[PDB]
Amino acid sequence: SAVSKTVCKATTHEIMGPKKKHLDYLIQCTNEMNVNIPQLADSLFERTTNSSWVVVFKSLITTHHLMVYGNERFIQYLASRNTLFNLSNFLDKSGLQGYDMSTFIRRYSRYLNEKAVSYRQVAFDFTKVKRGADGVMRTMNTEKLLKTVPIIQNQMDALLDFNVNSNELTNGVINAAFMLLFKDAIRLFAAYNEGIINLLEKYFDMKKNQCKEGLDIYKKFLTRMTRISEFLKVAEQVGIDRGDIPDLSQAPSSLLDALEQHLASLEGK
């Protein structure tokens, strides 16, 4: 009940993101093994049944914050559910602000759903695993890599589909969501990029059908890069510390012709 009470405090009608003090409490909750994760999640789900965009959006932000900063047993539990958020028809018509925010609530809930689905499918969180030449994405074997990168790609699509303009970030609730989306985006991009580095190191030794898969992955990566650039430009326009924006220039983006020529040779007599 203390947990439920704090979920309520994190999700009041006040037009601002959940307060740090309540988020910090709920993080600590996830770290105590005696805490019942399903009951904490149920409280969050219940708030998403509220008619107010403010309450619903704040419950989603709280859930996202806990996925990012909480014990891994939290996202593990969300990933175990058959269904997560069901907000595809959400609409708060109480006012123009409610209309505006309803669209973003639908898109944000879809992203969190996909974040849980990604975790269910690969049994780790792309945004939090070890990086580098010795990290998870860089060391992954061929079969697993070909399976995994499309999952990253699907998660990134759902994130980018939030599709907000800088001039739409006009209240503290949506701004709070955006800051967490920004953090996930740069971390998810690093995983995507490492997956592609790995793919390119292996591509010219793969089987014909593996190369077809790899080439599809690469073409899709190139178009997502363009979208990620657009998303970072929104972050730049709104004022985010430029030192926090990653450099996309080092993504290995000039290999299309080589990949195609190699596959073409495999498809010849």
Author numbering: 20 to 288
Cite, word for word, the article reporting this structure:
Here, we show that the R-SNAREs VAMP8, VAMP3, and VAMP2, which cycle between the plasma membrane and endosomes, bind directly to the ubiquitously expressed, PtdIns4,5P2-binding, endocytic clathrin adaptor CALM/PICALM. X-ray crystallography shows that the N-terminal halves of their SNARE motifs bind the CALMANTH domain as helices in a manner that mimics SNARE complex formation. In this study, we provide structural, biochemical and in vivo data to show that the internalization of VAMP8, and consequently that of the highly related small R-SNAREs, VAMP3 and VAMP2, is mediated by specific, direct interactions between the N-terminal halves of their SNARE motifs and the ANTH (AP180 N-terminal Homology) domain of the endocytic clathrin adaptor CALM. Thus, CALM:R-SNARE interactions ensure that R-SNAREs, required for the fusion of endocytic clathrin-coated vesicles with endosomes and also for subsequent postendosomal trafficking, are sorted into endocytic vesicles.
Attempts were made to crystallize a complex of CALMANTH with a peptide corresponding to residues 10–41 of VAMP8, both with the two components free in solution and with residues 10–41 of VAMP8 appended on the C terminus of CALMANTH. While these cocrystallizations did not yield the structure of a complex, they did yield a 1.8Å resolution structure (final R/Rfree 0.182/0.216) of the unliganded ANTH domain with two molecules in the asymmetric unit. In both molecules the positions of the first ten helices are identical. The CALMANTH structures presented here in conjunction with the previously published structure (Ford et al., 2001) suggested that residues 265–289 of CALM are not integral to the ANTH domain but are flexible and associate only weakly with the domain's core residues (19–264). Inspection of the CALMANTH surface showed that the elongated patch on which the ordered short helix 11 and preceding ten residues of CALM sat was hydrophobic in nature and of the correct dimensions to bind an α helix and was thus a good candidate for the interaction site for the hydrophobic SNARE motif of a VAMP. In order for a small R-SNARE VAMP to bind to CALMANTH, helix 11 of the ANTH domain must be displaced. This dissociation will be facilitated by the fact that helix11 is only poorly associated with the rest of the ANTH domain (helices 1–10) and may be further modulated by the C-terminal tail of CALM that follows helix11 binding to the clathrin terminal domains that are displayed on the underside of the polymeric clathrin lattice (Morgan et al., 2000).
